[PDB]
Write a protein that binds this ligand. Sequence first.
Ligand SMILES: *[C@@H]1O[C@H](CO)[C@@H](O)[C@H](O)[C@H]1NC(C)=O
Lengths: 240, 640, 277, 240, 93
Amino acid sequence: SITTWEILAVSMSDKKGICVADPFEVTVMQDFFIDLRLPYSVVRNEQVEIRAVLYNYRQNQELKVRVELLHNPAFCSLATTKRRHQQTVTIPPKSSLSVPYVIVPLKTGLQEVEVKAAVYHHFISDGVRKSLKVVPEGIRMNKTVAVRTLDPERLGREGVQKEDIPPADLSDQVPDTESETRILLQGTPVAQMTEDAVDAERLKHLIVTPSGCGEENMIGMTPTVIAVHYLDETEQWEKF
Amino acid sequence: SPMYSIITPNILRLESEETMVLEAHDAQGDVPVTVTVHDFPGKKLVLSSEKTVLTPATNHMGNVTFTIPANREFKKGRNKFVTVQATFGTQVVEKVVLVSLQSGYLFIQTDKTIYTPGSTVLYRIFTVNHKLLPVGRTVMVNIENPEGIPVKQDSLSSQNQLGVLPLSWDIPELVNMGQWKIRAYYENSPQQVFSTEFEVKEYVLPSFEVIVEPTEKFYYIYNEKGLEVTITARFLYGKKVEGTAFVIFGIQDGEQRISLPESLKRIPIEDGSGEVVLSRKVLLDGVQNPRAEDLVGKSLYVSATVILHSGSDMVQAERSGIPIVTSPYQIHFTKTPKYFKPGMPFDLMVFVTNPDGSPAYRVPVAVQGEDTVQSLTQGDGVAKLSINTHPSQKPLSITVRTKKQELSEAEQATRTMQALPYSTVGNSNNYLHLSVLRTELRPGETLNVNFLLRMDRAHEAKIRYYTYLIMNKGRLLKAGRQVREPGQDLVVLPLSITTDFIPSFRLVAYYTLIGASGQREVVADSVWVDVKDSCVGSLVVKSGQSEDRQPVPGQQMTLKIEGDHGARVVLVAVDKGVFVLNKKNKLTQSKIWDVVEKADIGCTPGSGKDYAGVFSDAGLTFTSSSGQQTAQRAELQCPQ
Amino acid sequence: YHKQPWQAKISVIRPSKGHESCMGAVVSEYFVLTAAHCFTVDDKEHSIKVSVGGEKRDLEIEVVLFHPNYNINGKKEAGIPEFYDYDVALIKLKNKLKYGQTIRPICLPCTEGTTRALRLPPTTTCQQQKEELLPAQDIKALFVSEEEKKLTRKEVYIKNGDKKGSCERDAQYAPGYDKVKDISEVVTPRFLCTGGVSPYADPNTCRGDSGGPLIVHKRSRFIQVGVISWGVVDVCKNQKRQKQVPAHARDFHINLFQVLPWLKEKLQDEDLGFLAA
Amino acid sequence: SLAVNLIAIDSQVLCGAVKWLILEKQKPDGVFQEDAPVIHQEMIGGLRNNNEKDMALTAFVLISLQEAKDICEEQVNSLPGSITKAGDFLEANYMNLQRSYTVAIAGYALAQMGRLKGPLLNKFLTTAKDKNRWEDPGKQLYNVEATSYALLALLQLKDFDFVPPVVRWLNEQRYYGGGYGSTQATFMVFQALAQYQKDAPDHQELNLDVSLQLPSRSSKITHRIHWESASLLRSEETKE
Amino acid sequence: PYYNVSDEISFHCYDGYTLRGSANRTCQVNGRWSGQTAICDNGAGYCSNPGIPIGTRKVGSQYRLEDSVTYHCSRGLTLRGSQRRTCQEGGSW
Ligand SMILES: *[C@@H]1O[C@H](CO)[C@@H](O)[C@H](O)[C@H]1NC(C)=O
């Protein structure tokens, strides 16, 4: 790739610790090169146009280039197994030229496009071999077969539950195309119960100073002991 | 009568070592101390038990460090506490402290910021404690779709892996586009969950980048000149771009965008650059509000689009968040303490910034009160002021403005705060201030900590030493004494700043004596100081080649790596074209310290309403045998 | 229907009742690999009967060879009642077995016979086979279980990938291991962890299945790589299957690649052709 | 024995009173008898009216011993023996009780031993009217206190399927203790609700063994969904 | 651009990937590479990564069940074996 690679480093010392380094850029360029740009995906049987731009960053030197598009049974261009669809152009100094290419994806899947180019009276050449997806003619649909609910004992029997699922329609399915069925399971709380605790603001009277004889002392000590105990578990010393 | 004190962080952490400062005032001879930590509620012994002896040779200071489990008994809602008990021979001093189940920090690194349906997401997890060090722990990792529903869950262990968990996740061809998420957390802390997002979308790497930088990082309302925006566009390999640009403006209300169709221009991009100006006329024509003072507070966004002359590529850029303020500056007392000392000097930590949020360099500031008293803002965007205070108990109100020349008073910024008096035990008017020369501290230098005392000579001779403690990343870095002979109103502490203080550190100093009538008084003071945030050690990656020229596609190059010894370095090369569509969620050292700093057990920048407040606001729990203990802390995070 | 010739059923009669019910695997014309905890020093040869091929009669054994490093009671000091480290043992029969459509050996790791089974070159080292049979991923294996006097296969997954630690640490829920300091001490490298809920709900091993062969079905061949040792949660009580099994109900086995030196020595005269390495 | 987690309790005193009840005031039957009834007959709660003094008192003293068992296990050596004696007694007469109060206080005493099974366990549950309260015709002190002992018994038996109705009845009655003769009610109603806040679940048993088999596949696809691994998208694709 | 005789090449997987086969391969006189095919699998698919034999080009990253992958040789080379492999039930292509 002709661009700037941004390398990132991360150290992990058992002594010092963690520390991420500063981004170190690395520019990678070439005097003469081809910039082949293809779409993310192209529809099958549809005639499109890819653009191959040839850059010439030579300060002051025009180039006589002869770019060519290699043949591929997966596509239908003006280049066959015996003919070579190629042009001969002259790219001015410090400039670029776009070379149009009309093709027709004949088969689906991830295909391959390659273009080469050489200059006259010089030892310079370059080529690009990238790939592009070929989406089958039609539209992306997602028929929801069914949305059943799983919960034995309620809609089951003897502890088990049977749930049949009829095959998808796919009546208007595009000829010669594949398709998958995504079965999906998932739990769901169900997280309930747990009751609320008595507000500590309602217990601002259980703080009685223990007093009396051998029996009255305990009677006055009880409301205080159990009160603090309940507040320690409910952690309601905040509102209290 | 003797006095056995104890100081521990407001919140104790699990699977770590918390320092425990023991003291005695005064007593004589050797005094054995048996520290025992139980759970809560209930005295279910025992978590951790330590022992030590206070010898007068060490001025009666203890230094015990316990490690709290971990433990599976600590499992939803509410909080968990531990009963920290310390016996000093016979007199028992106990105090319950809040517990943070947190085990440490987790940082997730993804190779790219955006992925295409079909590729694999390479991501690693770093398991470090509260001290940012490699540690073997068990981590739960989940990957939620754009609909926030986990599609993959694991449970790795960084044990014997040097705190680095290499992972990957294959993206199916048929996948839901959107903002995916990678969540992770320690098995012992299901509440503390870290997250890192990555976008999944069908895209193609452009050939060049488009940058949009306005002449100013803001916009003045009465500025007739308007908003000038620069359009810089160059290829990913440095070369400049030749094409045409399509720029359009718009006003952004509260989570709302009102496009301005009238502000559409078509500027030619020659020599890899362009220039567009938004007339003030169109800006006002956009909104249906005659008054221009109504736009104050809103923002503007630029939407440019560069297209080559070959029509082979087309990049779309955007610069949103352009503050339309009346003052090119802002003032924040967030770094300034909210408590003062009656009579003693009050220092201010003015924090001047720009409309965008970036620190301001050299900005004259002063207080409405006294003139001449000014201080040019430093590099970090912090000024140093110091006004005087009256012995009165009347709330202090300060109004700091900006005396920036080349700018009218009507275009300046102002902010007013309020400080509360420092309550004294028995109104003995015994205070303590800690003035520190505000300078950008750097690891390896030295700092001068001042100890200003205020009290009558009726008991000033009893003050023979201070007690300073260093708070760092929620722990006790160092604790010592500061000698003082009767007559010294100001002493200096030769503090050596190392690489540990990073990022910031707090300093709490207190003194004890017998004033009034056999009454034990405690007076303290805290101060927050920031240090130059940088790597603990060092790590640089430069080119190994002898400069020369630029590499060629398919060439070998030496990659020099200057890192720490015994350290494991993980690399990752990414095309800059990737950051063109998304440059968010990028792992940076700045973000690392950002998480650590926003986790301190302290809240108040310094000082408190009283002695027991200074410790709690700094991150310490002082508890003696005389009866002076700090406030209880229940909530994990800071108030508000 | 009997698609498990290697499968063997072991029974040990003891006073009062006993009837220790374990299982083994025919590995040669005399030896039958099986667990070691199914037997004890007290148990003689006349009290141990082994039946293979579904034969009604019981074969008389000669001697039970335990692993030199087997010590189930060598951890009581640390408070660990059970210790199934190196839980393997061979059973040399008194009579030679005539292989038929009901009796047939099973491939053992690091053998010239297994090399051909994996269709690998003769120059394949022992280390290469371990990478083929036991990769660093979620291996797909299976074991033989007995339900209603009828043998049945149970497809499971060996947690040898990144889910290895998750499956091992669940050994803490096991009876007696509830107070173990370091879980890595009760789970030696000589263990292969299986069962669980991820990636799938793997069937658990019973008490009668103990000593059962851990087989990896590849290339239409059956390769034994482990031996059923012990389980975390007992899900079989001679009544019905638990059905409500915990998410930590794991099953541990004994990696044969770790006990090779012992197997190669005891089976030197069986023409199994063990690799050097 | 409850304030041991709040203040400092001398083991000589706590265990001292326990040893006295065992050696002195306990017949070979394991029954505890009262010789000097307290002057305040209102602090004893549901023991004032004695239709079944033997079963009630023996259960009351028994519970107190089991709450101090973990403490006086070092000093008192005849404690385990005494606990068993009283247990054998209550279990032999639990099927003959008439008052809902005695059934609750004795049920919780047997629950701590796990000796509340079969017919005994069945009686304890059926006694509660409307399955939420162990009430007896007369007074309020005898009602709230009884239900409290029963609640602690349910939590002890880990039967959180019958607990919600009970706990709900207490909270929906609003009794913040305090007053005349509220010594028992207060100490129990808050002891049960506090113990409930610790033993309170969060959801219901989530363990689905969903196994789906496809015609174009030999083996089945078995998946288990637990509370921890809930809300998980377990998908399975099939091109057919 | 081309590998002469007795030329050696090494393979190395990324972090989180296991390397099966021969890491170091040398060009022999028979115009072939020594050792087995180098494959970098993470072990996340129902079937192991089919890998990409030297000189071929695999099309298909998904290694689920019933999934398939196609291969294509360079210009001037004859593809030997299968051009399409489907992940059959039982972990095997
Ligand atoms: C079906 O797929 C399409 C494409 O992403 C989407 O628009 C639609 O919401 C999907 N429907 C369901 C049921 O999720």
